[PDB]
C-alpha cells in the first residue's frame, strides 16, 4: 500500500508518497480456476455478516468498502460483502474501523442498543404503528435478501421477514 505524508516546515509544505509493506494472497488457492477471490477459495454461499476475518480484508481502515476493480470481486460477491460489512458495523463487530473524527470532536453519549442482522440504517426506519391484518401484515425485515442463496443446514429456509 501507499501512504501520503504532509510535512510543513516553516513556510514550505512537502507532499510525498511512500510504498509500505503490501500483503500477499495465500499460496495455492484450492480452486485456481476461480474468477474472483471468493470462488478461488470455494467461499461462495459460505460466509455471513459475522465472518469479520473474511469481511475485513475488503474494507478501508475507516470502515469503508474497497472498489471492485481493486479487490477483483465480481459484482455479485462485491454486493454481498458490501451488505455484510454494513451489518457488521451495525452489530459492533468492527470496533477498530470507526469513522475518522476531526480534531476537537467527541461524540455525545448515545443510547446503546445491541442489534444484529440489521438491514437498514436505524435512523431511516419508522415505527410500525399499524400492523395490518394477518393476510396483509407489515413485516420487519431481518438479514439481507442478497444472502438468500447461502448454504442452509436446516430444513427451514432463512426467514428474512419477521
Amino acid at each position: 500500500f501507499r501512504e501520503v505524508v504532509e510535512t510543513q516546515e516553516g513556510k514550505t509544505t512537502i507532499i510525498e508518497g511512500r510504498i509500505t509493506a503490501t500483503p500477499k494472497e495465500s499460496p495455492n488457492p484450492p480452486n485456481p480456476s476461480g474468477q474472483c477471490p471468493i470462488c478461488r477459495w470455494n467461499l461462495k454461499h459460505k460466509y455471513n455478516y459475522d465472518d469479520v476475518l473474511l469481511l475485513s480484508q475488503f474494507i478501508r481502515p475507516h470502515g469503508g468498502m474497497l472498489p471492485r476493480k481493486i479487490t477483483g470481486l465480481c459484482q455479485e460477491e462485491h454486493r454481498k460483502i458490501e451488505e455484510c460489512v454494513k451489518m457488521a458495523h451495525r452489530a459492533g463487530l468492527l470496533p477498530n474501523h470507526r469513522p475518522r473524527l476531526p480534531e476537537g470532536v467527541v461524540p455525545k453519549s448515545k443510547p446503546q442498543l445491541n442489534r444484529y442482522l440489521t438491514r437498514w440504517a436505524p435512523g431511516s426506519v419508522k415505527p410500525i404503528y399499524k400492523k395490518g391484518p394477518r393476510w396483509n401484515r407489515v413485516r420487519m425485515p431481518v438479514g439481507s435478501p442478497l444472502l438468500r442463496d447461502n448454504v442452509c443446514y436446516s430444513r427451514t429456509p432463512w426467514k428474512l421477514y419477521h
Binding site: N28, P29, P30, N31, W41, N42, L43, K46
Partner: peptide, 8 residues
C-alpha cells in the same frame, strides 16, 4: 497445503 475442496 490446501486440498481441492478446502474451504477456509
Amino acid at each position: 497445503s490446501y486440498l481441492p475442496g478446502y474451504v477456509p
